[PDB]
Paper text:
The B complex is a key intermediate stage of spliceosome assembly. RNP rearrangements driven by the RNA helicase PRP28 lead to disruption of the U1/5′ss interaction, and stable integration of the tri-snRNP, converting the pre-B complex into the spliceosomal B complex. In the latter the U6 snRNA ACAGA box forms base pairs with intron nucleotides (nts) of the 5′ss, forming the U6/5′ss helix.
The 2.9 Å resolution of core regions of our B complex structure allows more precise molecular insight into how nucleotides at/near the 5′ss of the pre-mRNA are recognized at the B complex stage. The 5′ exon nts −4 to −1 are base paired to U5 loop I nts U43 to U40 (EV1H and EV2A–D), whereby G−1 forms a non-Watson-Crick base pair with U40, which is additionally stabilized by hydrogen bonding of K1306 of PRP8 to N7 of G−1. Our structure reveals that the 5′ terminal nts of the intron, i.e., the 5′ss dinucleotides G+1 and U+2, are recognized in hB exclusively by amino acids of PRP8 and DIM1, respectively, in an extended conformation, and thus are not contacted by RNA. The extended U6/5′ss helix runs along the PRP8 N-terminal domain and is contacted by the B-specific proteins FBP21, SNU23, and PRP38. The SNU23 zinc finger is located directly adjacent to FBP21’s zinc finger, and interacts with intron nts +9 and +10, as well as U6 nt 33 in the extended part of the U6/5′ss helical region. In a previously reported B complex structure, an α-helix of SNU66 was incorrectly placed in the density occupied by the C-terminal region of MFAP1. Our data reveal that BUD31 is already recruited at the B complex stage where, like in subsequently formed complexes, it stabilizes the 5′ end of U6 snRNA. In hB, the region of SF3A1 comprised of aa 409–449 binds U4 snRNA SL1.
Residue numbers in the entry:
A (entry chain A): 196 to 664, 679 to 682
B (entry chain T): 880 to 1025
C (entry chain C): 109 to 951
The structure:
Amino acid sequence: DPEEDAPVLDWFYDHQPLRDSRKYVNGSTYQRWQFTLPMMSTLYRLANQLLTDLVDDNYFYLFDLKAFFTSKALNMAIPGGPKFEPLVRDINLQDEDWNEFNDINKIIIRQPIRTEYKIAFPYLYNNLPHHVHLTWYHTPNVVFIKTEDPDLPAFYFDPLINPISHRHSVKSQEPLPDDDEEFELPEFVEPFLKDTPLYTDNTANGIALLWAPRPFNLRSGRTRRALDIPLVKNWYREHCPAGQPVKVRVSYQKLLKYYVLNALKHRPPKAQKKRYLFRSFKATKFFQSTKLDWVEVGLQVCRQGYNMLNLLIHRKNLNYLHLDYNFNLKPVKTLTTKERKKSRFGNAFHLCREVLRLTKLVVDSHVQYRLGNVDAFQLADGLQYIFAHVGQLTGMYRYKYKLMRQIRMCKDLKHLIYYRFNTGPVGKGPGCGFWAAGWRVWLFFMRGITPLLERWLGNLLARQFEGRHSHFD
Amino acid sequence: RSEQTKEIDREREQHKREEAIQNFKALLSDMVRSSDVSWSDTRRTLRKDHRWESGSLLEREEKEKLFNEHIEALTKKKREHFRQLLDETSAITLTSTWKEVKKIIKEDPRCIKFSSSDRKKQREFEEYIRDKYITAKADFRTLLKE
Amino acid sequence: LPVTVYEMDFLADLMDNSELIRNVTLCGHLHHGKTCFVDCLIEQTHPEIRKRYDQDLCYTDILFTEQERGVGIKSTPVTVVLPDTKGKSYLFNIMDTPGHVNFSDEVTAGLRISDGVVLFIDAAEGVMLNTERLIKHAVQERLAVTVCINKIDRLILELKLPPTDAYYKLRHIVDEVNGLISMYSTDENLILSPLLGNVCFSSSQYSICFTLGSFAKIYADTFGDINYQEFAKRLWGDIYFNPKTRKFTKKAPTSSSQRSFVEFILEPLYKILAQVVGDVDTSLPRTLDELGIHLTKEELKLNIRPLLRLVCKKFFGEFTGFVDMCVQHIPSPKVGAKPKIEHTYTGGVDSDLGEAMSDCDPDGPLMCHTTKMYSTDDGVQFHAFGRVLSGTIHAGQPVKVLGENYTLEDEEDSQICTVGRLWISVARYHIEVNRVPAGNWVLIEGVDQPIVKTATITEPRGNEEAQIFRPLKFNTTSVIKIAVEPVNPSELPKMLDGLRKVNKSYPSLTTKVEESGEHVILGTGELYLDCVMHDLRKMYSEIDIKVADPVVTFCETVVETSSLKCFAETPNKKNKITMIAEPLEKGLAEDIENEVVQITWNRKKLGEFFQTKYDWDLLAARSIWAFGPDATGPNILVDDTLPSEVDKALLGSVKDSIVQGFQWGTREGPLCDELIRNVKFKILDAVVAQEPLHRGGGQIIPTARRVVYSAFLMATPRLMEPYYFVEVQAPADCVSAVYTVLARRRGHVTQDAPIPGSPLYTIKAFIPAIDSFGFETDLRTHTQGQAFSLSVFHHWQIVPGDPLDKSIVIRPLEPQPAPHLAREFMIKTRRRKGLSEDVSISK
RNA sequence: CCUCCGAACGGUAAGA
RNA sequence: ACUCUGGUUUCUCUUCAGAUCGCAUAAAUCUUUCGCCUUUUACUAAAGAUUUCCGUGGAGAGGAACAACUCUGAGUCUUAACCCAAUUUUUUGAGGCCUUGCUUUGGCAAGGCUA
């Protein structure tokens, strides 16, 4: 709307909005930003679909990170919480047998001691509570009232607020015999802010921004990488809805499990010297810099990867093998056993081949968009399909099976999004294009695989060019 | 808010009604101890207590039904006690006589709670013996089916 | 030492002058901004200590359990120097006390050594359960009450009430608190109103704190030629401001004018907050310039909440209104020492120490009262903490520590200890000092060993007349009962050591060893015992300890008159004690326990009361021998002997043994070894023969026990379980869930009322203490974390069923029906005590 | 209700 | 109401990195256990320790680029309309003399005269 969305209208869909404007960002390097309250309000309203209606953390009682750490340390799972393996294995939990202290005939049972109690108060209801985390007890109930009408005054007695009772006044001052002149203020004395109005049209929005999810309660901040915004993290951090199928519930629990594991295993980054690869590359005479269309550089990367694997194949004189442009190794003819054993590559070549296959699929979907064959909505749906169906489009799970962990995750997110997407007038069938969730997962997979693949391919290429890089008796 | 108060008030009413029912049940269990006492006779005699006004949200029909249920439960307890005491004597079997049982269970408080006279007591003992004979027939059928 | 505004030696100089000292305890409900207020005070005094832009400082939350849970657990002292409106420095001894009801005892440990109580009220919540409990406790401890309404920003930035409606909410809070105080007191000088200076309005998150005097002084500074004392006498109530006459009139000038408090105080505050949070970029610099507030460029770039805090710190400045409140309405130790000795000293004010201490002489006989015990950093030794009521305690001076059992006749419970270092606690750094004069608060090392919970430190060989201070009376009763064992029995010794240390850390903790070797801990609630066991496992013992499922401590009562005149014949077969047992009238036990009636009274007043309100025979009323099992115990031993049968001289020589035997017999109990409660024992026939050798104490006391039990057992005995009172602050749509949860736990709702000036509802209900385990967790789970509840012990209520009904079968893993409950609860209690299964009348 | 669908190798006749 | 001070962007490098480096989250290696198991990988999933990788903050240095100019800080942060003022400062009648006594004169103290 040119009227409602004026603060963000002219820069909302730019690639890097407000980059040139020194009022909002530090400069072209895009490190810091500092917005105004109307812009923050418009952005917050535009994002109210991906945010939570909760103004308080009290919703996450026995469902925050500390509760999950406690349940993991106790080999217990809260309803909807993740399951883990026990911390202490070699101490049997049924080895404790019927002594006089655990005598069943000695204890009174009226209400069963659920596992919720053993985590709310872990030192009371649990024996040997090792590595338990005390959950935050209670935050005072935020009674903020969201108003969906700007016409309402920023301050007004809401009908939701219960009315206050009748009069009472015990002020028994001395009844003055009135032949006197009483107190008078000086001539130029007035209330402190008589001039300023009680409330403007940006006051209610700022008050609403106070009780807003991060970063919409922020005024300034630092830019983050586009892959560092999960955008659905608070969707599986809430309790799963009522009538969801079993697969959706287990997807919520698995996303929650990996969130818990990431939060628990997190160690601070180590101090190190600032090594930069592309800066070193640019410092040589063998690398130049330009500004290319992303689709063009994607096609260049696909062609270069194809040529590079094909050179790796033709180096070993394997004419009976054919690397196709979708990165499929193919037998040209029926191969003899001697030809089959000479056509046996390691997991390095095949993992690079499958990663290039996935990149080719993504860049090819983008090319199909640019050629006009497929439009933007179907492009987004195709990317969402690709990043959630890597187990079928590509085959890198058979050369590095640990990445199956990623695949399951990309399926889990597919559930989490779909049952938030296909609600109401929206049914099943293709159409969801919220591909950020799986795109992040595959980027983080590549983050850890890059050193491994680089080491493997360095060994392989060094080998191509004659290079390398009862005990005691 | 109108919907909200309607929802709250109906459950408030249900809670008060069920609390009154529980209080009347507690009064029935604390004072009435004999199954031979009539329901309305005690109701016309137990109204002189202190908490007898605990049924301010109850009518004569509900109170009489609750008294009937309590009397039935007390009679069941007395019958179970009589049956349990009938499992101790060796003369009690599937073909015992009531005349001999009148001396075997002469000073039997459980049987006295079951029946004051020999007619109802004999009928109950005969019913129990018939049940025991049916159980023996079931045992014979289970043994002979294999 | 961290850098402060004032000289440390100046603080030591303030120590000598008892007039320049205020002993203030900050009390209130859970999470009503008590700790954040102390955070603001620390920030005001300590320049280098500042709140994080995102996380609360929580300076007095020094326990790791407190930091993780977020709930204050133990009271923490801060001794600071604070300037008032006039600028005169004062030495404030502040007790930051927990707001959770289960830790009410902790508040009591700070109310003993405090002269004044500042009671914090959430402006958005109002008066809550612990607020009422602490009003009652502080008034009944004879302390000066000053209310402070914290979190007034919630009326603005969160409830968004119009300023007139915010004034109405504040007025409702003040009026409700005044009604509460008037209910539990007699004086008219205990009325609270900001007109008198008894109330401060504050928001501790944004560092707002003002009385009418401080805001009037802000007006005077911005304008001049204004008597801010005379001006502040008019900024409250229906007094309006006519600008035609520049006057203040109790009538409305127009037909739609506002109050003076709204115009001059609330409205500028609303406009300040609105301009900061809504128009930070458009009209904020002009608004700040109009207020004479200059912020740098790097300070306007802050987020909205740090900016609000900074702006309100620049505008309001310092918490001078709070200091005005605590100076003008809380007596100094010298002024307030007379009622303190009148109330909490056994010898009273009429002794030679009841006046040497009432003057608060810094150079008299050393008499200090230590009522807190704070752990060392490692957790091996302890530091006592208490008020120096008289004298000047020195470092190295040996002292005589007197426990709670020290009397003048029996002086076994005393020890000569060496006072080590002395500290002044500012809650995160201890100022080590050489001496502490009277009227102050002191940490003492070395004297901890003979101190169990509360101790009186006096001069060795100085005052042979020195008695002890009265032991702490707690607001609630330790009811929840856990049993602890060591995982490795070989480590049973260590646990005992640990069980001692927690016994010193928690004033209401009741540890003991039962007959069957069980180690039983009594606490007040689930959170209380969870913190106790965290400290027992992690802090002190550092071993592995198994817990039993918590239970409650039952009591035993009667419902009918005993059918037989239960008699006991002594082994010499000459004394025949024949008694009956019947229940006391409804509420008589409440009168006995609350010290409405006392055994120290003359027979005149005691008989007058018992004839006035209970319709007895005056002969029987004059003949009330003993209250059991203690002087305050809710059991009565009425002598019903006829004048012409048992002579008074024949019976007065054996009354004492009968009384002691009755006391310990009601202390033990014959059903499941529990206290006998609410029983009247009429001694009908006391056949006592002539020989004084055949009627000795060892001849009567066990016989007194036997006759007590026989009278009890024939009077239709019943079990009584404790009932907790629960307040639930739940949203309006989550009330049905509260009803459903309370239905499963034998709990009935007394009331469910909307909270005025807030969208929430308050549900007040009664729940059995044995059924209230995990009740808070179930309530918060079933209401999506919205319904929060606090549970406190309220009363005792008969367990359903007959405990002695031996015709009841019990299946060991099934919640029994109500008529069987009393049969169940007794048996499984006896098995835990290590007693016989069935209770037999033949003993 | 149950939806986690893996892979490669250990499969070369040796000769003329 | 004034005088002296004086930037921003961007690239690269060298170091220090506690900090939610990171309001995000990968991989590998080793040591314990865990599930399979038929040989290596490839694996299952928990703990601890290491690395590696995608990133980040602080300081310093050297360049290119709106650099030529404010702002910030410090500094007392300059004056005549209408007030010559009747309790603690710089326009307030309070001003003096002698007697007496003390004191080595000097000097000190109480009293009187007071328009």
